[PDB]
Amino acid sequence: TVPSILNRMQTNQTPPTYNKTNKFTHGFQNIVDAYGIGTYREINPAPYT
Amino acid sequence: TAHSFALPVIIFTTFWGLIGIAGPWFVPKGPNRGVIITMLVATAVCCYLFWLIAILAQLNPLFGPQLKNETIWYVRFLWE
Amino acid sequence: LCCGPKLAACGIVLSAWGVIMLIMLGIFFNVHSAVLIEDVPFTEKDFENGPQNIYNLYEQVSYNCFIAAGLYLLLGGFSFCQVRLN
Predict the structure, then answer these.
(1) Would the CB atoms of B74 and C54 count as touching at under 8 Å?
(2) Residues of B in Cβ contact (< 8 Å) with A48
(3) Does C50 contact B at CB distance below 8 Å?
(4) Mind telling me which GO cellular component terms the entry cites (chain C) (predicted)?
(5) C15 exposed, middle or buried (CB, 10 Å; 0-12, 13-18, 19+)?
(6) Is C31 an 8 Å CB contact of chain B?
(7) Which residue in chain B is spatially nearest to C48 when comparing CA positions?
(8) Hey, are the CB atoms on A47 and B32 less than 8 Å from each other?
């Protein structure tokens, strides 16, 4: 009966990078990932590549 | 056999400009919209630039080709 | 006769490519298209009186290409039969 809780917090660790890839763009996203994944929220070269 | 350099530029410029400028608006409101617009715009850039370089490289030539006398004799009949 | 399905698939793909390309090549030679002059078997004495003397050889090579395309079509048929068996 008594519920659980989900908590936010001030964080010092660096966020990962995520892209919501789709069927068509997966190969290109991998192509740009091959040389290092972009830092949090920097411009992705995948849509232009 | 004059290909006046006004019609080709008009045709391909309006063609690629429409692809790169008007097509983006016609892409529907959806999740893949941004990627699709980027494809349209950058395809316009790449292909239009390729064609423009190719045609300007022939505009105002400095020299004419060199031909074996056999192909001279043939093309003399074949082409205008 | 019988053969492996991969061999038959390769045969049918090769037959399709050959048929399309060689039909096109025969068409383009029968057209007397200029870009393929160097491949015509003419001789240095065939350039005297006019283009007809070399038009004839263009036609001959076009017929050769059509014959090759027919051979590839027959190969494609046989490979399709082989695929059907497999």
Answers:
(1) yes
(2) 38, 42
(3) yes
(4) membrane
(5) buried
(6) no
(7) B73
(8) no
Resolution in A: 3.6
C8-11, long-range: CB < 8 A, 24+ apart: C8/C79, C8/C80, C8/C82, C8/C83, C8/C86, C9/C79, C9/C83, C11/C75, C11/C76, C11/C78, C11/C79, C11/C82
Experimental approach taken: cryo-EM
Token output for B14: 């309006």
- What tokens does B64 get? 């004419």
- Count how many pairs of residues, chain B against chain C, have C-beta atoms within 8 Å: 17
Q: How many CA atoms lie within 13 A of A17 on its CB side?
A: 12
DSSP string, A1-49: ------------SPP-------TTTHHHHHHHHTT-PPPTTPPPSTTT-
Residue with tokens 């050769």: C64
